[model samples]
Target chain A: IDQYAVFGNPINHSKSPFIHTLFARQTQQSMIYTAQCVPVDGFTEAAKHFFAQGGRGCNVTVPFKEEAYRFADRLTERARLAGAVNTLKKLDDGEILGDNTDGEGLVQDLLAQQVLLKGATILLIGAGGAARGVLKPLLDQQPASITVTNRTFAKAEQLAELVAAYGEVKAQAFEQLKQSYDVIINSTSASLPAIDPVIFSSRSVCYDMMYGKGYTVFNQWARQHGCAQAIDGLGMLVGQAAESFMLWRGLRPGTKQILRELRKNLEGAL
Target chain B: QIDQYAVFGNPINHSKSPFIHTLFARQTQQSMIYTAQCVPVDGFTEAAKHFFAQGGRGCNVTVPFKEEAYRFADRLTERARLAGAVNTLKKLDDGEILGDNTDGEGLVQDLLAQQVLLKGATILLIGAGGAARGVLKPLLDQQPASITVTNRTFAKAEQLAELVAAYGEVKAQAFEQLKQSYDVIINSTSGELPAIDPVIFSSRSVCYDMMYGKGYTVFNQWARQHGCAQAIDGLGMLVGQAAESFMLWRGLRPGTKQILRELRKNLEG
Candidate 1:
């Protein structure tokens, strides 16, 4: 059997093991997946040792995605465009392939939920890692245009500059927004940064890049603001994992069942 | 997003590969984008690495980079190894690169499609170069009676025939000494048509040139002046090789007839 793991600090209670374990069993592939917590600064050494010890692949999360981007000998377009990597697979040629499945996962999840991305005017609420990761895949849909805004105007400008080559992208300060767009997405997670709920309209679909047993605070705010559809990020997580699974195993695992099971079990969990 | 594919060459300005592959994809209903990209002569490895790293499904390599692609591949197919070059590179399920040469089989397929006899028929292969080396094994595999190879550079022809002497009967002759006609004549050299004997082409003999154009190619025109049965350009072989690579990548082979017709009209116009 082949070995795989996810490397990140404070890696406890990771659902990658649950999701991939089910995927392996469903596909009948002989493999094992686990989550390992490593020191924030020990990513290089830990990744080196794992590959040297014949580890097939690993996932990089949190503070380590940038370092993983540098560690790979090659990168997929999404990873390059994102300037970060969340998945690394040891290619048969002994080269480690770095890829960011984050964006595609988000796009897939959005498309799955019938959230129109192509030709839709999209407003992104944050310019952080999650924001960077999803830009290229979002732009690939040939959206009408994308406007990125953050608490700091410069960060939002940088994010839009990075993706302007691929699509129609513009960055504006949060204060400059005066009209409601087709979609509003919040990519800042963890403590739930406050965003003005006025960005939402009755027809607007609001999405938060965080999820748990119930509505995320951002989505909850969206509902209070009268937005009919407010979605969380659990589906994005499952979708990203499936993309990584395809990179390592050459097969796409079905995410519908896994996502349902995760939400069903989250009834009593975070 | 859809899968990505491309052809890499220094002067990839008007590559027919993208045209051929786009048609192939539409024919098979494969959701993929195929484009033509120009890379510097010294930048093949980096460009290749970047392309594959960026989720490129596969690519076709052309001129000055064929050898580099051969070295770049983690592994080589039997034909690629025999030809000592690679025209196609595919990223495998195991994240390995496989290099293959379809140039030889491309010609073989074109000839068979044209219904020209190769089995036990006397054949003449003009020139001794990479193009000539690639088609030797496949042509011999058809069990031609004997293939007389003529080259401006005598020793090169001698060495090529000797390289494949174990597989079939191949002999070397100087360009000026070939005065007899054969059943099939293949010109693999550049434009001047190899300065061969006019009598070498009998009325029943079929002629093939590895270069194609909008109208009659220089070699094909020469063959017609000498009254050959048929003068086939390399267009079909071009489409045939692309089809083989398409099959290698997508597990399906597409018809090249309509594609060839479209390409001809575009070129001729």
Candidate 2:
């Protein structure tokens, strides 16, 4: 059986092993997936030991994605653009290949939700790493434009400049985000506690990178503000894991069944 | 727009990257041009700079230029830094060049494809040169129980082992000291010349030589003569590295079994 694992700091809460284990069972692949807690500075050593021990591939989460990006012998273009790696595979020749599926996962989830991406104007909130990771993949969908707004305007501008080569990306301050967007994405770590509510339109779709038993705070705000649809990040979480599973196992497993089960478990726990 | 890509080396005409990448592009329906270019010994930086300046997306570096490419890169990936060499280059959107090495991963993948167990297995690595250095960290990542690197000069082997000592259980030894059998014995030395005693091979040992031709490699033949379980060559490594580079340039990995078989057949022809 092939060996696979996920490495992260504070990794006990990661759903990767559980999700991938379900994927394996669904796909009938004989592989073992586990989660490991790695020290902040010990990613390299732990990864080396894992690979040395005949580990086939692994997923990297939180704090170690950049380290995993550096650990790879080669990186996918998406991984390079994201400046992070969430998935790694040991190739047939002994190369450690790195890739980031987070952006792709988001895009895939968006598509599955029937949100038109091509030529759609997108408003991405927050200029943090979460926002940075999805810019390239979103741009690849050929959006008409992407305007990134952050509390700190300069950080948004910095991210805009970083991805200027791909497509039409601009920066806006939260104060200037008065215009309604086709798709408004909240990449911030928390709900905006003090922003004006004029940015939402009854025809606009809102997506938050956070999920909960009920509606997420951001999505709840979007629904209150008359947005057409408000979706949480639950699908994205499963979508990202599915993409990583595909990278390792070479098969894309169905996500609807697993996502439904996870949502049910989350609500039951709540 | 047609994106540009190529391979750089002192004598790069024989590079299989163009063939492999072209196949990948076709398989994935990506419209791109891939080629191979020979660079003057000291002209790698100039050639690479020009290529990227002309909107070249990426290229592969080989032979004596990997180190130079490493120096030319604006940033280095962790594996590239560990290997102290760079065989792949990418032009980031921010106009920075990133250097990476795929050789080690290529070898590891090939070994797994061959069903060679690396976990908890005793491994013997011969030679301490660039070839050996390029693969040490990757092999160490395989979590072998122990890796004993033996070289003609014990000091050189010892130096290489020490460099990556923090990664895993690796030690240096003289060829004469390799009395016990290994689960996997890898010969990374040059030429078909016999240099070590053949007592290291046992009936269950798997021998792999980092060289390939029509017949078995000298080291592999020696293992076969000593009643080894299996003997393999480096053809798969070549295809494996090319597949990795292709995946880096284009976000898809091409199947290698058919490619490796075709390359081997062409090699014999």
Candidate 3:
């Protein structure tokens, strides 16, 4: 069996092992996925040691994604544009390739839910790392426009300008977001509690990057405001894991059953 | 066998990492030993190599040793490379050491925990020293509207800003050049700091001093006097960084709310 793991701080809470284990079972791939809690500064040493010990591949999570991006011998184009790496694969020739599956995961999950992305108007809230990681892939879907917004308008403007070459993207402040969007993604964590509900439209879909036992606070507010769909990030979590597994094993695992099972476990834990 | 971990610094006795990690080990049920070691001013490289040779799993680097730790590492994480310092080190199975800097993330995490808005906020960072450099990239990573670095010596601040100009809108100015207020102001300056004009503080601004003590720090007190929205000390950052280091080593995140409360109580006593 090939050995794989996820490198991150506070990694014990990760569901990657469970998600990947289910994926392996589904695909009949002989591999093991473990969660390795790396010291905040130890990604380089830990990753080198893992690959040195015949480790096949690994997933990189919070606080280590950028470090992994630097550590990789080469990066996928999406990973380069994303400015972060969420998956790593060791090729047969001993080359370590870093790939970011986050944006693809988010896009795939949204598509799985039958949310159209081609030519859709997207309003991505928050200009932090999370928002930066997904913009390239979201833009790749040929969205008519992706308007980025943040509590600080400058950050939103900076991010929009950074990826201006990709597609139609603009930065707007909360007060300037008068137009409704097909999809409003809340990439900001915990900041939604202070937001005005006017940003959400009754016909639009709202997605929060954070997930919980029930609807996230942002999603709860979105639902109350009559959003057509108020989705949590659980699907994106599974979707990202599936993407990672596909990179490692060259087989795309079915996410429906696994997502359902994980959701059940997550809700049960609460 | 239990894993061995430690923090290395000159004035190491005051470090709260050992206490914090001990709590984390117990909470996570991880069998590990952690301690604080005082290394001589010039003995960091030697002591660090010796510890790793003796099977030390990992260690945290502190003041006067972070730069030396950076030099000692066989490899470095991007944050550490950007910080020009190392606060965390781990010995890999291949006998190579990796260096990482978590100070910036710790500050970021602490501010988020407190609900201090970073995204799209204008920030004024006081200090051009290593403390300021260590946190700048992470702060920029938060995508703040703008960060202005002000110092008594304008050149140093300007140099730091130019170094990170590719990241975002960071500019440098002298203390006298400050003509506008900011949403957040962070002090990374030394004690007995430069006299800052109180006009810089706005009623809507949140002040953060990277120094903490039994009472309000000088900068924080000034901010409070000027009616700034909040005046926060670096105590939470200390715990926050420790928690980050603990999570790196232990894979579990212990609640900082309780630990911060306990540490404050003990600090006041």
Candidate 4:
């Protein structure tokens, strides 16, 4: 069977192995996926041994995401902008191709949820790495404009300026987001206490970048108030795996039933 | 004695097999000897018979002899049969000659080396000749979202895509009908450039031409001028196929990026 794995420090909590296993089962792919917890400074050495010993592909998370970016022989546009690579595929010519599926993962899940991104006003809540990882893909969807609420404020401004070439982007403070948007995305680890309930418009679909056994704190808040839909980041996790699977296997997996089993099971419910 | 290998072609003077395989042998520390030989157009069978009869372990058939080699092999790999041609022939211990076509794999490897994605990618393959035929199956194996084979002549393209329809999503289209942008566009044609719609190129697009010249290939110039994410020629593919051939015969694969860089420097000067 072809070998595959995901790497991170303290990677025991990663759901990648399970998600990829489900993907292979769905596609009847002959492969194995596993997790490896490498030492913080040992990413390069671990990556070297992995590919040198017949590893076809692997996923990188946390501290390794940036290290994996530097490890790549080539980088995707999205990966370059995200400043990280969550996916690495070994090319036939012995080259390692790195990609960032995080943003696209979020974009695809939102699209699957029928939350229109094109021409829709979007409010991005945070300027941290999570927010940085998603800005490019969301903007690529041609959003009417994305207003980012950041505590540092300058960081949000930096992000807006960095990606201004891609589309319309603006930066604002938390309390200054007086008007609601068509879509509201919360990526702050606060994780939502700093966010205002006033931004939850009736037409808004709320997406929080954190999840647990039930609705996350942000989702619960949005759901209790009255957003069209309140979603957690579980789909983003699965969606990113799906993208990574496509990079490795050459086919896309249907995440609906898999997501159902996962959510049902997160109860672990699919 | 070192294992012997040879590449036979009508115009053997220009073949890169010796240079690539010798480099590969040295790199991988394999004890193998490789050479290129010119054979008369009608004398391929006799030349092949003599080579193997004289203890040739493996050999590569280029140009006019690929089809001839397909018939010459005692056995055929699935891909070789599907492709109706063979480029690499191996003499098994049982004395059965195993014929395999590595052209498609070479192209695929080259594309991957260039960091051009395949899986879930939409592809536009131009031309449906022997070059296209050799690559279709390997390309399809990558599980691309779809592959639309187009040619100046529609029947050939239709049959080519239909030949590999069971493998993945492949279909044929007329040149003028290609409007939407595909993620990766591959040109398998030689000589004159095919007139394709510029609308098929986007910032996300990558293009490859199987024909190489200058520091760049002909078709790639058009592709690059249109602002594709990248435009690649076939030199890397030539080295890639040779690498695969070396691995097939020597039980090891060699690195090609340095050889590719050398070839590029030569091209640049």
Candidate 5:
């Protein structure tokens, strides 16, 4: 059995294993996934134990993502561009390959949902790792213009400079942006609990990478502002899992079927 | 006179069980003295025997002593039989030692008390060793839609799953084959850090690490990065388990939220 796990401290409550098991059943991959709670000081030890025990892949979460990034024998272009990694694949030679799929997952979820991306002006909020992960992926989609705005202008400016070569990406402070783009993604966790509608506009397509039952605070804010569409990251989650499934199993299942099912499940529970 | 109770373990210095049970005693106005006792690895059965001999009404077990406690018990509860370990030991009026594992009850309480939906929810349990073994049956008792146990040693995970197969839809998986996401995921490993990927993190997923850190661990950082809805640490389980142990000893369920907050504040300060 190919061993895989998502490791973190205090992982008694996680959905990765269940999600992956569904994927395994759908694709018929003979793999095993579990949640691992390791110690803050024991990431290396735990990871080594897993690898030495004939484990092939691991999903690095939380504070250890950077550590995983450093542990990789080889880094994918997306991982290198983001300067962080969330996925690790063990090669046949026992070497580990690291990559960041958060951005691609976000973009793929958007496309699958039929949100227009080509030639559209996009205003990316939050210049943290979340923004950096998506910068290259967004640029690769050939948007008309991409402007990154942040609470602090320097962080956005620094991130833009780092990925500018990838596409026509620019950085701006939130207060400096007078014109709204076609889409607005709230990458910040600030609005996770409560809605702050300072960034929503009627013509904008608002998406919050954070999600919960019913509408999230950001989505509520966007909906109140008459945004064309206000959605959460659930779709992105299923979409990204599909992408990872493709990498590990070389098969792409119908994500919409799963997304629809999960949505219904969440909606009913709500 | 207050009845005395204590938890025995090698790592007794850091245990919060005494604090939790003491709070439960205060809440219920039940006179009780709870203390933490550091027992050497080889001294479990002896320490337990001495505790009850000295008018100790009950004792909580942790880590290295749980299996030993199981062996020392004169009778075992159904849950303890399934767990192959014991965390709560009560001295019956007949002078018989009764063993029960309350970690599973504590886990279920933490999930329910926090208003986390578990019925029909899929769960991922990490670790197939003793820690995971103790909570498997209780988790199945909650009647979740499915349960998958994963570990570095695939066979060990498979064995645990097989042992608990009669409970519910429990199975085992290898890491490379992990491809789907669940609503709830749990980490039962012994460490404070974990290996996670964004692919394993669903935005709608609620990630709880069974181990909590004094501050944010790397696992919490990754959960936030992936935008998990409720990325919780294991502080809840710690308090909940303690409360269950207290309930077993004192015949009263303690108020955990208040105690949990105070403990959390103390941990932070």
Candidate 6:
């Protein structure tokens, strides 16, 4: 069978194999999926072994996405733009085609969640990897404006200046943030440990890139602030996986069941 | 006519074991030939004996015949005894036979090399077939706190789990009853697709499917969506196992990282 897997250091918590399995089943594709935990230094070697043994595709996670991007024989526009790849598909001719679905997944999930986009002003918190990855895709959606605020001012300003040609994207320091926006997305990992009001506004949709059961500290904080919606990254996770699955298998599965199932399972967790 | 070694199976021709061993020979300057042999069904025992008699020092076994190879060995390694299967066969100095299973050791090496924390971790094994059987003992040797073996055929998995109970804490169950999370989930099922749910992933649950391929399979995609911290394929296992077999036959253990890279590049080409 055509085989695929994910590679990450400390990979015990990966849901990729399960997501792709459901995608395969729903799409009627014939493939096998698994999880691989690889050392930071060993990502290149581990990834090489995977593809050498007739593996068709793999998801790269954590500290290795950039490594995968560099390791790729070819890169898709999105991946090149994101400066990283979370998906690696083996072409029939055996070339590795790398793509980043994180941004696209987030956009698609945002659409699916019915968050307004066209002409809506948005606030994106954090100018790090997650924010940078999605900035291009988010700008492509034709939002009225996207104000990027970061803990560090220079980085946010740099990113905003970098993407100004795309749309009305601007950067601001966290302390100087005064105006409200229709949507606020937290791209920081700090939401998991404790509450942070880095991004929140009444009548705004708050989305956290970090997903888990119950309210993430960001979600709780958003709900307390009367945000219209407080959503986690689960949708983005499913959406990105679907994007990768399609890249490998050429068929998109019905993601609703799998997404709901994931939500249920996350709810059942301790 | 060079001193040769190989592992036979129906799908052998695509195997990199030969390539891996060849690298071992080249690195160590051991004059030897290695190639994969795709034997017909029901011909494992005959093919193996013939190869050994033909001056093949040893051969690796894959799928369909690990058990048969185990039966053919004159003696078994401790790992092979626990696995009840053999993936490597060495022609001993006395012309006797030495059978060993290196799948588990390969897996252990890959995991340890990756720094996967296995101490007191709750682990899940997804298949009970021959491949899974071959690695059980080595996995237990790592001393995980508990290992639950689940399969489409629960009885088969349970039987195998029982076989290795003395080595460590192990249990077997059907897929439906698997509501708990695990530190590591080893996918060993034969299904063309993954047979589990993403919800099973705890934030710390590591998903390790013993399957490898060119790109993201259903399992890898699922792991990513469920917020799994990490997911990995089985490419390292293939290299690790081949290295083990090379050591058995040539008394040389080659570094697998470079070999795996070369092989991956070759495959992509």
**Candidate number with the higher lDDT (3 or 6):** 3
After superposition, which runs of candidate 6 have C-alpha atoms over 4 Å from their true positions?
A9-11, A39-41, A191-202, B1-269
Predicted structure with the largest lDDT when compared to the true one:
1
What docking tier does model 3 reach?
incorrect
Model 1, stretches more than 4 Å misplaced?
A1-270
Candidate 4 residue-wise lDDT, A1-270, digit = tens: 577877763322335655676687569885666554353358888788789967899888786788899999999998999888889989999999999999999999999899999999999988877888899999989999999888767888988888888889999888676788899998877424555677888889999878667788778888987888988888998888899999999999988766765565455111
Q: Which stretches of candidate 4 lie over 4 Å from their true place?
A: A9-12, A268-270, B1-269
Computed on C-alphas against the true complex, the DockQ of each candidate is 0.01, 0.01, 0.01, 0.01, 0.02, 0.02
Which wins on lDDT, candidate 4 or candidate 6? 4
Comparing 2 with 5 on DockQ, the higher-scoring candidate is: 5
Indicate the residue-level lDDT of B124 in model 3. Answer: 95
lDDT of 1 at A196: 55
What digit string (tens of lDDT, one per residue) describes model 5 on residues B7-113? 77663434566557656886889876565555556667766765675466888888888888999999999989989999989988787999999888888889888
lDDT of 1 by residue, B1-269 (tens): 23667777654434677558767987898866565555556667987886676566788897868989999999999999988889899989898999999889889999998899999899999988888888899999999999998889999899889989988989999988998999999988865567777999999999999888779998999889999999999888889889998999999989988888888886676
Q: On DockQ, who's better, 1 or 6? A: 6
Docking class of 4: incorrect
Task: List, residue by residue over A1-270, the lDDT tens digit for candidate 2.
Answer: 467777763311335655776687679885666554453448898789789877898888888889899999999999998899988999999999999999888998899899999999999999987899999999999999999999878999999999999999999988877778899999988635455777787789899988777898888888988989998888898899999888887899999887876676555422
Model 2 score (lDDT): 0.82
**What is candidate 6's lDDT per residue for A154-257, written digit by digit as tens?**
99998898788889998887877776779998998772323245445666898898887788887887887778898899989899999998888778877777
> What is the Å distance of residue A232 in model 3 from its true position?
0.5
| Model 2 CA lDDT for position A157 | 99
Q: On a 0 to 100 scale, what is the lDDT of residue B138 in model 2?
A: 95
